[PDB]
Write a protein that binds this ligand. Sequence first.
Ligand SMILES: CC(=O)Nc1ccc(C(=O)O)cc1
Length: 167
Amino acid sequence: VNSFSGYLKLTDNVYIKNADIVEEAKKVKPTVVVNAANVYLKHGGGVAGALNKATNNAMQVESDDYIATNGPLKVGGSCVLSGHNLAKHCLHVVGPNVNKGEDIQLLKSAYENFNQHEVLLAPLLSAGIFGADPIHSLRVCVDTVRTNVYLAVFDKNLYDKLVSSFL
Ligand SMILES: CC(=O)Nc1ccc(C(=O)O)cc1
């Protein structure tokens, strides 16, 4: 038993809810919140801008030190940093950005990072301003992630379409 409430069960291990990933993290304080990162960990908009704003920019300060030391992530890759006031840890995962021409086949590699963590609160990778089809992103999630993932879909209209079209 865990602290997640109000989720619809899609599979043995995947759950979904219409919720803002920021408000959900603040309420649950999960072990792991996933950020929809880019390779530079420049948290400007969407999940990353919203998560970073909720940390009063501490996520960005930590991220800049990480990049100064390690260089950029790979598309499909991840790093574990602090969760600040939102979670124990933040798993920053880079899905391909369709609006930059990145290979959508890298979405499966991106979701494979989630398997290193027993439970996660996450957004749909490569959705929203990353330009991928969210229905596709949910299918890859279900077919790739084997650990317990609690998906927060911000858009109510999209949430209803994801549920009603789910195979
Ligand atoms: C404030 C705010 O922008 N929140 C969010 C939450 C989730 C997403 C997303 O999943 O794309 C985008 C934006």
